Design a protein around this nucleic acid. Sequence first.
RNA 1: GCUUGGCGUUUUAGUACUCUGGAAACAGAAUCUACUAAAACUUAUCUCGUCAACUUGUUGGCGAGAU
DNA 2: ATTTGAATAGGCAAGCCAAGCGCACCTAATTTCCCG
DNA 3: CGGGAAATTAGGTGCGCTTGGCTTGCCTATTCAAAT
Length: 650
Amino acid sequence: MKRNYILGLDIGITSVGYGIIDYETRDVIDAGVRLFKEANKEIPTTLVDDFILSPVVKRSFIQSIKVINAIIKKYGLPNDIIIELAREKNSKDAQKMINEMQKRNRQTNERIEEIIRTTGKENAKYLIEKIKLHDMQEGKCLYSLEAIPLEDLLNNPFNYEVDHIIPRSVSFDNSFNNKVLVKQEENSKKGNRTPFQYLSSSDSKISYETFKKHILNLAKGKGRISKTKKEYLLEERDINRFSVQKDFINRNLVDTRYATRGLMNLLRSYFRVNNLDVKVKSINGGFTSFLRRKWKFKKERNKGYKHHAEDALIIANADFIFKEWKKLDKAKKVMENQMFIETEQEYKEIFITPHQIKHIKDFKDYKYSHRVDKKPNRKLINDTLYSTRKDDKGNTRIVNNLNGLYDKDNDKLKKLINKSPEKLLMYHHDPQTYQKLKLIMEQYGDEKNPLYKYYEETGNYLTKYSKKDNGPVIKKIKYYGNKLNAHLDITDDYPNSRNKVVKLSLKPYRFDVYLDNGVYKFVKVNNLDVIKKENYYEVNSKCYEEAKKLKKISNQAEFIASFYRNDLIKINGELYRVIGVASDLLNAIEVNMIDITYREYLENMNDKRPPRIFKTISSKTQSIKKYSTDILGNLYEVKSKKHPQIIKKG
RNA sequence: GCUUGGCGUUUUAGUACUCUGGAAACAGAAUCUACUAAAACUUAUCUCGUCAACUUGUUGGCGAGAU
DNA sequence: ATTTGAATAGGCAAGCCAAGCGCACCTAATTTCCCG
DNA sequence: CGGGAAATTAGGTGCGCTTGGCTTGCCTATTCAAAT
């Protein structure tokens, strides 16, 4: 559209958030998320292949580019793009960082618990950050070097103040590493100067040399200070030099990782070459979280995928602040990589926005675009082998095995004997050993595992029945499991095998829905049913026609649609995304929600249902419709081809 | 692409182990439980145009439109 | 009027990921020995 | 007698092993409503 806008992006391991806002008013236009599985005319994706990355990151940059290309074609060229690459590099690194963060959140809260016991005051817990700075400094304000009593901080919270080591106006750093607990008078005297500049002036109580020695002694050994904090405390360069300010801006505002640099270089190159006035920027992972604390907007990653989108809208509003405030013009220019604030109150006033955050938080019309997998899954089948047997009723059944019979907490056999004694093969074939086992289960019924007590009390494993007491130990028990339906037969690998040798869990490729005289019906196509040829896969025709016959699908039945993983389905007027075929036999298909994983939907509600949706396709089913989202999450109601596909060249 | 081995799943061969013929050797059944030996484990949807694979009526890529 | 089918809850199992515990190896600080 | 360098001790880091949760495929079982 004619209207001019900003594009936020929150790039992640599995996701690319986007957020679109009016360049004049800062009202929300649009927002959504593009979701994908972690890789364990318009902007091309071949440039990502040029410069070397982790696979996990490499996928996201390809996905991001296609989301930018889709926004450009819909809304036209943005005025400003601004990007946030997630802190993590892969999911393991993410989890490690979350664990490290959680460990720190434990380390902070454990210090609170000890002091509120000792002192016995309530305003302590409100004073979150002033407590931890007392730990770092070893009980002394660093500018003066005089002692802080612990209760004196609680008695006089005014007479001490959290100071920024390097003025926030120059560094843009609000991190704990740029913070120090100091006396109120010392803060007032320092002003907008570094410790070096202040302690070199006539206003200071102590010499810089004394201070420097203290910091260096504080750095090594126990009660340690971070490298970044140490560097800030010992910053000697002229704050007022542009080169020095540039360094602070680059450290705090501009993200400094090889990937993030690589990405913005890709994008800026593209716009530069084609002569398109687009201002690509980036912001530091931490910085967004400051704005969330500032604007009272608790990061809830459990509040669906929208968190990625509502991160992008935040990132996009930061861009508005780095355009409307002439005092940030230097910072703006640094962030745009273009060739070339006096008080704390002034700094704080620049970033006050109460209004448009209500728009962001109360915004509703989000969109989601899950990516669809149509590659036959290398995993064909569970590799476990099962023997089979025909039971009393003449049903072929899977043979399972009970292992770990003599374990403390194993109730599998006790459950099975009480419910289904006829499920044991030994029930039919070794009655004398069966009767011998039943006497044990009756003897030590009260425990989880009767056999554990048999081993504990007597000190002897259970042996097969024998006339001379020389039968072998029993270490596994075979029992009849599932009725045998869809299986793979591998018995010709075992010459003269008495019983049939099989594998199970025929991993679905897709399911094809048919409308047959007003009744909705479907066929499952297995990965086994798909066979690699020269440069293509082929669905097996004979297995397919046999499958229709078990489902009683007529020759004059209309095909409706094929549904792969993450394909969208509207069942009785309710839209979902497909996982797969829960049960061919029962005619069930596994779906999920679109805006949130159904697990998380239930957790935010505090509901204790199973976290899976299953939808039965039946005489009761009234309409089935296929939908498809574009890469932005705009929804479309879509038809099918006349017949199902057989060959798959991709 | 080749070789070896420990743990696990399956089977055969032989022996142990249940049942019947037999004084006993020995044979048959049954195949449960074990020991010894061998083998194996990039793409959203439809429709149309166009091009190519070969399966010759289907598919995949690309362009346009719609959804 | 009774029998068959639908929808949801609850469990089993394979594969795969991730986090906490234990053993062996690597780096820095303090104490002891030798020289100005 | 005091300061600097080397050897020994204590603490921190990295690799490998194990268990619980997550994603998916599917069967058995229970309860209610519709069809022959």
